[PDB]
């Protein structure tokens, strides 16, 4: 009935413990030594963390609680402002905006996003086709330009042509400027200035777009035509703005993190990549992936639930209790009080997954049935899950199977994991080596 | 712009397409060939056909479309009249018996019908604790013995007393045969029978009202509340032919769609032995008293997530019918003219990718631990509107209690390993679908 709490500072509470480039995987060592629930105490805030999927399950109860904004998310705010990852559920533009996005994410909706996805995926394998045999390549690096350049063309139908350039597009650099310092906050005149450029070029784009009257296949056009159907409202023009700055915020580095992650395990178990690669060859027989084939990926499917099991790119979400309630028989709370879920540790529960749950295999993916419900949770939870989540696998399975039926890798430094934070989780320093297969592309 | 259609043969349309005795399983392979709608004609009628969420929301709006009374409805109307069910929207005794009895079918007033229905549900549990263990269950006929009795007791305290007996009360006889040559006509002597058995159903009902008057005697069921209400527009009863047209209509309406809800759940359960488990065990945390109280049964949560997921797979009603109030414009594609049909295909808008996920043949009552995050009209398996189900709350909270009572008292088996047969009347059910119950001993 005592919850366990790790060292604290006097009047800094725990908050020391977090002083640290790496506060995600200091909190994961916190929860190896006290179990499943710790509590976590900085000046004016309680936090208590989860780590077992007994608790989490009942966290995951939305009678009982609901999606808190945690500090981080409170900061990323000022540029994201009420899109939909930084909005209180019971916010007006959280519900308007859910309901007329919700359909565009689906993932029949993938269909029409697919030939742009496949532009950027051609161009990325383009780039490694043409290295020279003196060549490496940084993994994480080109995941980014990939993953920025998918969402800001299926966004919003802009390139920003991050495969041309050394210095990424001017948007680009103020956005990860922008999240870094509100990451780091956990400058000033920089970051207004950061902020402007990001509203300045998308609320350009959006008066272009309305003023031209075109109609294509991305985001951008599917809120300008939208209505909610409760309301009966459009978004406006300011929230359309924050959500198309929020899908690449909450999009563009948890998927270049899988991506990353994925192929860090793959060069790490050549068996593992083998099957893969052999999936990707009967599958993808045309020199241009089809949406079916990349639905046919089953493997590279699995592949990346289980790089997303190890290495969650998005590894904590904060949820508050809606009224006063007991968790798991043991532990009371009051209306308000903060749990975070800390998605690393849930996924090393080793009564939901064995005694192995350190191993990579995709295989504890092949029957999607028999997880348990609560177990598996990257894409976070109920209505406040991630609405890119058929996007970002449909990416990343659309990417991985092509990089496998093209190149053979080569982990050529025996690459160290060291996993960067930042909002999200990436293997900083990842490179590898690509020997080209010399198929049609 | 063009609506989608299926192909033509000439002067027989597409009716050649329709060659069955199951044509909403048919429709719903058809909408996954062509899409979201399509205009279905046969050489006497034409009819579209609507299967997206996102079409079926502008047919819900009351102020473009109406309640169509398509021709099964029409030939029921020959013994439910002028009925709630059976009724055009305009009809002034419609306005009138919906203003009057939605109180009397509201989630407050099945408090008052809950004794009644656990009545009947302690004599189905008792039915098969006193099976011998060379014997099994018939579950859509035990269900509609069950359905009916508890219409019967809760609309007009009448007793059909259907588990005494292997030949049903008269009166069911005739309705249910009613019923089956209403969909036949879809001949002499079904002519002459059909008027036997419309007189059978209307003697008794109509003795029933008048004994009731002449006695004054006060119930907890649906006919007191007839008798003593007034519309509070008009500031009129019903007649007593209407009672009548409308304790025939709850029959009619509520049996055979409640009766195959409970029927599906549990075969939804016995091939899914871990939902079966999950539920289960919350109905012997839950049920903790001899017989079920109205707050136990709300308090199944679970069991009323697997009984809407059982409606979302096999709507019991599948299909209703609307009509075009004025010219208008669908989706901003399809121009329809003023009285123009429209039929709602609820299976297939319940397989509707783009709001459940693309897993729509899984059996999943986690789908509906939140009710409120459904979006709007994605779920419609009590129709729409003021020309909704009236039932509803009644058919939720009977098959939530029975099914409840059900999994509390028996484990059961699937012991033919039965294979799904749809039977297509004016409603669904498995046909065929039989089981073994194994007491767990547990008394009342
Ligand atoms: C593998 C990649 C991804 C992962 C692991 C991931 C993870 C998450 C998680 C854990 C949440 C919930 C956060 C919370 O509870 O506070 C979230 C929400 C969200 N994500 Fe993702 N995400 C990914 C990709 C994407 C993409 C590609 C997009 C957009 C194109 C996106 C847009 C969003 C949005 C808008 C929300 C908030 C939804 C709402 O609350 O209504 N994410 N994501
Ligand atoms: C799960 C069981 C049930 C289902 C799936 C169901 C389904 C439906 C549907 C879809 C409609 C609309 C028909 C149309 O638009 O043509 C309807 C109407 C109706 N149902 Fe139910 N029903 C059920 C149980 C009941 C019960 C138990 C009763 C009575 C005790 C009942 C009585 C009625 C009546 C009177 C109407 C006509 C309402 C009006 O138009 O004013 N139903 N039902």
């Known amino acids: 009935k005592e919850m366990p709490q790790p060292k604290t500072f006097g009047e800094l509470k725990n908050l020391p413990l977090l002083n640290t480039d790496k506060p995600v995987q200091a909190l994961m060592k916190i929860a190896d030594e006290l179990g499943e629930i710790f509590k976590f105490e900085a000046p004016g805030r309680v936090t208590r963390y989860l780590s077992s999927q007994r608790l989490i399950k009942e966290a995951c109860d939305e009678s009982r609680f609901d999606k808190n904004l945690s500090q981080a998310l409170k900061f990323v705010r000022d540029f994201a402002g009420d899109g939909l990852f930084t909005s209180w559920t019971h916010e007006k533009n959280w519900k308007k905006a859910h309901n007329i996005l919700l359909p565009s994410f689906s993932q029949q ?106 109609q294509s296949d991305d985001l951008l056009t599917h809120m300008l035509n939208g209505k909610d159907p ?7 023009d300011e929230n359309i703005r924050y959500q198309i700055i929020t899908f690449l915020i909450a999009g563009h580095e948890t998927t270049s993190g899988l991506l990353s992650f994925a192929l860090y395990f793959l060069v790490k178990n050549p068996h593992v990549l083998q099957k893969a690669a052999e999936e990707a060859a009967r599958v993808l027989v045309d020199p241009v992936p089809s949406y079916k084939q990349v639905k046919q990926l089953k493997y590279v499917g699995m592949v990346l639930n289980e790089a997303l099991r190890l290495w969650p790119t998005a590894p904590a979400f904060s949820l508050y209790a809606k009224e006063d309630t007991v968790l798991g028989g043991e532990y009371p709370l009051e209306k308000g009080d903060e749990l975070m879920v800390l998605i690393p540790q849930l996924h090393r529960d080793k009564t939901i997954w064995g005694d192995d749950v350190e191993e990579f295999r995709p295989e504890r993916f092949e ?75």
């Open 230 to 236: 409760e309301t009966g409202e459009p978004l406006d």
């Open 109 to 214: 909706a993938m269909k029409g996003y697919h030939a742009m996805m496949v532009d950027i995926a051609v161009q990325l394998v383009q780039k490694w086709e043409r290295l020279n045999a003196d060549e490496h390549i940084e993994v994480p690096e080109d995941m980014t330009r990939l993953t920025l350049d998918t969402i800001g063309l299926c966004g919003f139908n802009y390139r920003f042509n991050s495969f041309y350039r050394d210095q990424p597009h001017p948007f680009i650099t103020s956005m990860v400027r922008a999240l870094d310092e509100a990451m780091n906050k956990l400058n000033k005149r920089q970051f207004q200035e950061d902020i402007k450029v990001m509203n300045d070029l998308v609320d350009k784009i959006i008066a272009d777009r309305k003023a031209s009257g075109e």
């Open 367 to 441: 029957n999607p049935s028999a997880i348990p419900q609560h177990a598996f949770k990257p894409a976070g939870n109920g209505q406040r899950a991630c609405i890119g989540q058929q996007f970002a696998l449909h990416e990343a399975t659309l990417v991985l199977g092509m990089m496998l039926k093209h190149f053979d890798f080569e982990d050529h430094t025996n690459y160290e994991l060291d996993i960067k934070e930042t909002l999200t989780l990436k293997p900083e320093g990842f490179v590898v080596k690509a020997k080209s297969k010399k198929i049609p592309l």
